[PDB]
Amino acid sequence: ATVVSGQKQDRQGGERRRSQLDRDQCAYCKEKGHWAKDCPKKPRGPRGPRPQTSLL
RNA sequence: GGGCGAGGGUCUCCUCUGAGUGAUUGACUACCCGUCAGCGGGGGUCUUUCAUUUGGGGGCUCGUGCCC
Ligand SMILES: [Zn+2]
């Protein structure tokens, strides 16, 4: 058996242009489902994150 | 079979392009300003040329010279 697949991830080859992006991806980490402005791998401000809920 | 030196593929880490802006130019010209009312200057737009932007490291693997 050989599976007929190779689990390729790409995002490399010689250039770093829009070649691995779409309007549903992140310019910073190349994930699909969010944009760089909300990247789960990038810092936030002005002095940390900005939540909208709390508990007591 | 292993090490050392170089490179390719692949993954990984540093990961942020989401169809911008300015100047040159022929024509047309929303709009504004001055006109002997003929036009003239600024402004808008399509064409146009130029500038602004394209890297690196590490693992694994393939490969090769030398060494063991
Ligand atoms: Zn992201």
Side-chain angles (χ1 to χ4, degrees), chain A residues 25-31 34-36 38-42:
Chain A
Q25 290 183 254
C26 172
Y28 192 62
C29 83
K30 312 300 190 284
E31 189 51 275
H34 66 271
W35 275 46
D38 197 29
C39 180
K41 302 187 74 196
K42 201 177 66 165

Side-chain angles (χ1 to χ4, degrees), chain A residues 51-56:
Chain A
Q52 66 181 344
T53 53
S54 60
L55 291 175
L56 294 92

